[PDB]
Design a protein around this motif. Structure first.
Motif, PDB file in Angstrom:
ATOM      1  N   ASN A 108     -13.072 -22.570  -8.116  1.00 39.05           N
ATOM      2  CA  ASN A 108     -12.015 -23.030  -7.229  1.00 39.05           C
ATOM      3  C   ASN A 108     -12.577 -24.131  -6.301  1.00 39.05           C
ATOM      4  O   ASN A 108     -11.987 -25.207  -6.148  1.00 39.05           O
TER       5      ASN A 108
ATOM      6  N   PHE B 192       7.695 -35.016  -8.462  1.00 38.79           N
ATOM      7  CA  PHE B 192       7.391 -34.464  -9.767  1.00 38.79           C
ATOM      8  C   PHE B 192       5.974 -34.813 -10.222  1.00 38.79           C
ATOM      9  O   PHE B 192       5.301 -34.001 -10.888  1.00 38.79           O
TER      10      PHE B 192
ATOM     11  N   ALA C  72      -1.083 -29.742 -11.174  1.00 40.09           N
ATOM     12  CA  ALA C  72      -1.254 -28.796 -12.272  1.00 40.09           C
ATOM     13  C   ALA C  72      -2.476 -29.145 -13.155  1.00 40.09           C
ATOM     14  O   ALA C  72      -3.223 -28.247 -13.571  1.00 40.09           O
TER      15      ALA C  72
ATOM     16  N   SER D 148      -5.443 -27.867 -11.986  1.00 39.42           N
ATOM     17  CA  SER D 148      -5.395 -26.432 -12.266  1.00 39.42           C
ATOM     18  C   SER D 148      -5.872 -26.107 -13.701  1.00 39.42           C
ATOM     19  O   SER D 148      -6.664 -25.153 -13.915  1.00 39.42           O
TER      20      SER D 148
ATOM     21  N   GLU E 278      -9.541 -26.161 -13.746  1.00 40.66           N
ATOM     22  CA  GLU E 278     -10.142 -25.029 -13.038  1.00 40.66           C
ATOM     23  C   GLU E 278     -10.100 -23.834 -13.972  1.00 40.66           C
ATOM     24  O   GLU E 278     -11.108 -23.091 -14.133  1.00 40.66           O
TER      25      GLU E 278
ATOM     26  N   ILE F  56      -0.081 -21.342 -18.372  1.00 41.16           N
ATOM     27  CA  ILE F  56       1.126 -21.122 -17.543  1.00 41.16           C
ATOM     28  C   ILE F  56       1.170 -19.701 -16.915  1.00 41.16           C
ATOM     29  O   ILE F  56       1.566 -19.506 -15.753  1.00 41.16           O
TER      30      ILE F  56
ATOM     31  N   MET G 282      -1.467 -19.606 -14.191  1.00 38.28           N
ATOM     32  CA  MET G 282      -0.968 -20.388 -13.061  1.00 38.28           C
ATOM     33  C   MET G 282      -0.043 -19.499 -12.217  1.00 38.28           C
ATOM     34  O   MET G 282      -0.218 -19.395 -11.001  1.00 38.28           O
TER      35      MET G 282
ATOM     36  N   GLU H   4      -1.849 -17.068 -10.147  1.00 42.80           N
ATOM     37  CA  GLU H   4      -2.375 -17.717  -8.960  1.00 42.80           C
ATOM     38  C   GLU H   4      -1.297 -18.061  -7.925  1.00 42.80           C
ATOM     39  O   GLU H   4      -1.477 -17.858  -6.701  1.00 42.80           O
TER      40      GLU H   4
ATOM     41  N   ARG I 200      -1.082 -16.610  -4.126  1.00 44.17           N
ATOM     42  CA  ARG I 200      -1.052 -17.558  -3.032  1.00 44.17           C
ATOM     43  C   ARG I 200       0.275 -17.594  -2.300  1.00 44.17           C
ATOM     44  O   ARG I 200       0.561 -18.531  -1.529  1.00 44.17           O
TER      45      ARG I 200
ATOM     46  N   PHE J  58      -0.695 -23.853  -2.260  1.00 44.26           N
ATOM     47  CA  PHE J  58      -1.740 -24.155  -3.209  1.00 44.26           C
ATOM     48  C   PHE J  58      -3.106 -24.316  -2.573  1.00 44.26           C
ATOM     49  O   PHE J  58      -4.052 -23.702  -2.999  1.00 44.26           O
TER      50      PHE J  58
ATOM     51  N   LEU K 110      11.978 -29.271 -10.872  1.00 39.85           N
ATOM     52  CA  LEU K 110      12.115 -28.008 -11.609  1.00 39.85           C
ATOM     53  C   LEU K 110      13.488 -27.375 -11.531  1.00 39.85           C
ATOM     54  O   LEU K 110      14.185 -27.520 -10.543  1.00 39.85           O
TER      55      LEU K 110
ATOM     56  N   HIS L  98       9.541 -21.096 -18.855  1.00 36.65           N
ATOM     57  CA  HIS L  98       8.786 -22.321 -18.606  1.00 36.65           C
ATOM     58  C   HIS L  98       8.859 -23.255 -19.789  1.00 36.65           C
ATOM     59  O   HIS L  98       8.834 -24.461 -19.659  1.00 36.65           O
TER      60      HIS L  98
ATOM     61  N   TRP M  28       1.708 -27.989 -23.603  1.00 33.99           N
ATOM     62  CA  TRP M  28       3.097 -27.563 -23.479  1.00 33.99           C
ATOM     63  C   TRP M  28       4.143 -28.262 -24.303  1.00 33.99           C
ATOM     64  O   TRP M  28       5.150 -27.658 -24.690  1.00 33.99           O
TER      65      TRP M  28
HETATM   66  C1  LIG Z   1       4.505 -23.763 -12.164  1.00 35.93           C
HETATM   67  C2  LIG Z   1       4.537 -25.234 -11.641  1.00 35.93           C
HETATM   68  C3  LIG Z   1       5.300 -26.073 -12.708  1.00 35.93           C
HETATM   69  C4  LIG Z   1       4.696 -26.163 -14.128  1.00 35.93           C
HETATM   70  C5  LIG Z   1       5.620 -27.004 -15.029  1.00 35.93           C
HETATM   71  O1  LIG Z   1       5.224 -27.628 -16.217  1.00 35.93           O
HETATM   72  C6  LIG Z   1       5.466 -28.501 -15.051  1.00 35.93           C
HETATM   73  C7  LIG Z   1       6.749 -29.311 -15.176  1.00 35.93           C
HETATM   74  C8  LIG Z   1       4.275 -29.139 -14.266  1.00 35.93           C
HETATM   75  C9  LIG Z   1       3.122 -25.842 -11.129  1.00 35.93           C
HETATM   76  C10 LIG Z   1       3.255 -27.149 -10.304  1.00 35.93           C
HETATM   77  C11 LIG Z   1       1.917 -27.319  -9.526  1.00 35.93           C
HETATM   78  C12 LIG Z   1       1.096 -26.027  -9.861  1.00 35.93           C
HETATM   79  C13 LIG Z   1      -0.002 -25.500  -8.840  1.00 35.93           C
HETATM   80  C14 LIG Z   1      -1.093 -26.599  -8.464  1.00 35.93           C
HETATM   81  C15 LIG Z   1      -2.477 -26.137  -7.976  1.00 35.93           C
HETATM   82  C16 LIG Z   1      -2.904 -24.829  -7.973  1.00 35.93           C
HETATM   83  C17 LIG Z   1      -4.380 -24.506  -7.500  1.00 35.93           C
HETATM   84  C18 LIG Z   1      -5.082 -23.276  -8.204  1.00 35.93           C
HETATM   85  O2  LIG Z   1      -6.088 -22.738  -7.308  1.00 35.93           O
HETATM   86  C19 LIG Z   1      -4.088 -22.136  -8.636  1.00 35.93           C
HETATM   87  C20 LIG Z   1      -2.820 -22.682  -9.330  1.00 35.93           C
HETATM   88  C21 LIG Z   1      -1.918 -23.644  -8.485  1.00 35.93           C
HETATM   89  C22 LIG Z   1      -1.283 -22.875  -7.261  1.00 35.93           C
HETATM   90  C23 LIG Z   1      -0.730 -24.219  -9.445  1.00 35.93           C
HETATM   91  C24 LIG Z   1       0.332 -23.128  -9.887  1.00 35.93           C
HETATM   92  C25 LIG Z   1       1.435 -23.734 -10.803  1.00 35.93           C
HETATM   93  C26 LIG Z   1       2.217 -24.966 -10.157  1.00 35.93           C
HETATM   94  C27 LIG Z   1       2.989 -24.428  -8.883  1.00 35.93           C
END
Ligand SMILES: C[C@H](CC[C@@H]1OC1(C)C)[C@H]1CC[C@H]2[C@@H]3CC=C4C[C@@H](O)CC[C@]4(C)[C@H]3CC[C@]12C
Lengths: 240, 16
Positions: free
Chosen positions: A22, A47, A54, A57, A60, A88, A91, A94, A98, A108, A124, A214, A236
């Motif tokens: 992280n 967007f 992401a 992410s 990571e 996904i 994510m 996480e 958070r 985040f 979204l 998703h 994806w």
């Molecule tokens: C689910 C969402 C949308 C995904 C869709 O495909 C699209 C259109 C990008 C995405 C957008 C930014 C992401 C976050 C960006 C950074 C982090 C930091 C990591 O420590 C942990 C994860 C975390 C919090 C991610 C969780 C998932 C998030 C909220």
């Protein structure tokens, strides 16, 4: 019973590796498009803001699975199969961890927080947003800590039934050590509440539904002029 | 197959 010296060492291993990966990805206020504050330059920037974040992410996640004992022993093919389906879900794990209940915002990073409406603004669908916030509340309802999350994310990465796995039986073998660790951990944490471990695994059930939603979010994304940068699009997007 | 279809991803796994 109690944790074996081994398991304890493993659980510490994971929690630490999860901390270091992280730091190594977010210790630097990312070089991503800034969140605006209306027009088509924010609706297309916001967007970009999420999409670009992401990516980090994904890096990571890949970086941390490389630290999960057993992961590097599989074949690159299976490493991809596994990683490509859990990104996904991991994510959302996480995102959940958070989540703030009083403010209902998912933060985040430090000085990097988003509300539900931020997600809507970000492009979204309400179809996707509500389920993730609903999932985030379900998650806090279980009161998971850092060891349990690390363990649940490991257990998640080693899902044998993920599409195209070459050595499922092998992936499955790799999972069990972690399930156990969680079983034994939870037994110690709330011995007087045996059903709390199954409530946990239950979240894996919902992460699949979320993963489907998703996909319908991706499918609908590429019905607009919103395209996923290359890395995301790979994992994806539906492409030959 | 799953490495060619996912070039960038493949790369992340090797930068380690
Ligand atoms: C689910 C969402 C949308 C995904 C869709 O495909 C699209 C259109 C990008 C995405 C957008 C930014 C992401 C976050 C960006 C950074 C982090 C930091 C990591 O420590 C942990 C994860 C975390 C919090 C991610 C969780 C998932 C998030 C909220």
């Amino acid at each position: 019973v109690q944790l074996t010296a081994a398991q304890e060492l493993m659980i510490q291993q994971l929690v630490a590796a999860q901390l270091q990966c992280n730091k190594r990805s977010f210790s630097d206020q990312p070089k991503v498009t800034p969140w605006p504050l209306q027009s088509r330059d924010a609706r297309q920037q916001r967007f970009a803001h999420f999409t670009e974040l992401a990516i980090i992410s994904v890096q990571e996640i890949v970086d941390f699975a490389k630290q999960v004992p057993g992961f590097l022993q599989l074949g690159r093919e299976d490493q991809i199969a596994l990683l490509k389906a859990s990104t996904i879900e991991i994510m959302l794990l996480e995102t959940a961890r958070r989540y703030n209940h009083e403010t209902e915002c998912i933060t985040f990073l430090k000085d990097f927080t988003y509300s539900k409406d931020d997600f809507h603004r970000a492009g979204l669908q309400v179809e996707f947003i509500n389920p993730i916030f609903e999932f985030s509340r379900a998650m806090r309802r279980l009161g998971l800590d850092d060891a349990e999350y690390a363990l649940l994310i490991a257990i998640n990465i080693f899902s044998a039934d993920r599409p195209n796995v070459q050595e499922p039986g092998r992936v499955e073998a790799l999972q069990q050590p972690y399930v156990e660790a969680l079983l034994s951990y939870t037994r110690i944490k709330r011995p007087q509440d045996q059903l709390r471990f199954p409530r946990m695994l239950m979240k894996l059930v919902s992460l699949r539904t979320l993963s489907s939603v998703h996909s319908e979010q991706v499918f609908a994304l590429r019905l607009q002029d919103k395209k996923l940068p290359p890395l995301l699009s790979e994992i994806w997007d539906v492409h030959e | 197959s799953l490495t060619e279809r996912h070039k960038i991803l493949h790369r992340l796994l090797q930068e380690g």
